[PDB]
Design a protein around this ligand. Structure first.
Ligand SMILES: COc1ccc(S(=O)(=O)N(CC(C)C)C[C@@H](O)[C@H](Cc2ccccc2)NC(=O)O[C@H]2[C@H]3CO[C@H]4OC[C@@H]2[C@H]4C3)cc1
Ligand SMILES: [Cl-]
Ligand SMILES: [Cl-]
Ligand code: NA
Lengths: 99, 99
């Protein structure tokens, strides 16, 4: 679709079998989801934003359904205040910015 | 133009007569730039990101060129790690997300 930006670009996602809302975020390199369990191995990572850094768990090869589009990639899980779909998965659904 | 997301969506902006690089950020409500001087009065604002909250200076009706497009609107100035163009100005240049 074409999403205007008058409001936050929130969409429904499916991850780990759970339905959530997430922000399509072109300013995020990586995808970051609020605390939840995912299967498989993970490793610790530190990521920084406005305010500073948080510790997260890095899970690789996770499948996510984004606005009904399937994608696979790394998902970071930790105390983010918002679920964020970042560029590593936006590319996989063919998302572009247009002006 | 049409901007894919395999790389960060960095563009050149011009503000207070200086050129800067900034991120086109659909995940940011507001535009936030690293510390610099701007004319006029400012007002206080606290904004929250991944790693907590920061105090910024809010300047209204500031002229800023973004990738060759004129915008005039609110700019937040503070200790952000990166210059971010948020939805308040992305709508002024006509930007949409497409997939
Ligand atoms: C390496 O992988 C990653 C992935 C994500 C991030 S990030 O989340 O720190 N960030 C990076 C960006 C360079 C600032 C993405 C933004 O798009 C956030 C996303 C985000 C939204 C809300 C809460 C936390 C993070 N925007 C936001 O801070 O905007 C505030 C400021 C912008 O204006 C408003 O809109 C959201 C809030 C608020 C003040 C960092 C590392
Ligand atoms: Cl990935
Ligand atoms: Cl592509
Ligand atoms: Na894995």
């Amino acid at each position: 679709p074409q999403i205007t930006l008058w409001k936050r670009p929130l969409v429904t996602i499916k991850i780990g079998g759970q339905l959530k809302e997430a922000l399509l975020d072109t300013g995020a390199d990586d995808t970051v989801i609020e605390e939840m369990s995912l299967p498989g191995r993970w490793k610790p990572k530190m990521i920084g934003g406005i305010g500073g850094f948080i510790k997260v768990r890095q899970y690789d090869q996770i499948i996510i359904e984004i606005a009904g589009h399937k994608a696979i990639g790394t998902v970071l899980v930790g105390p983010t205040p918002v679920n964020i779909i970042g560029r590593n998965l936006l590319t996989q659904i063919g998302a572009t910015l247009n002006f």
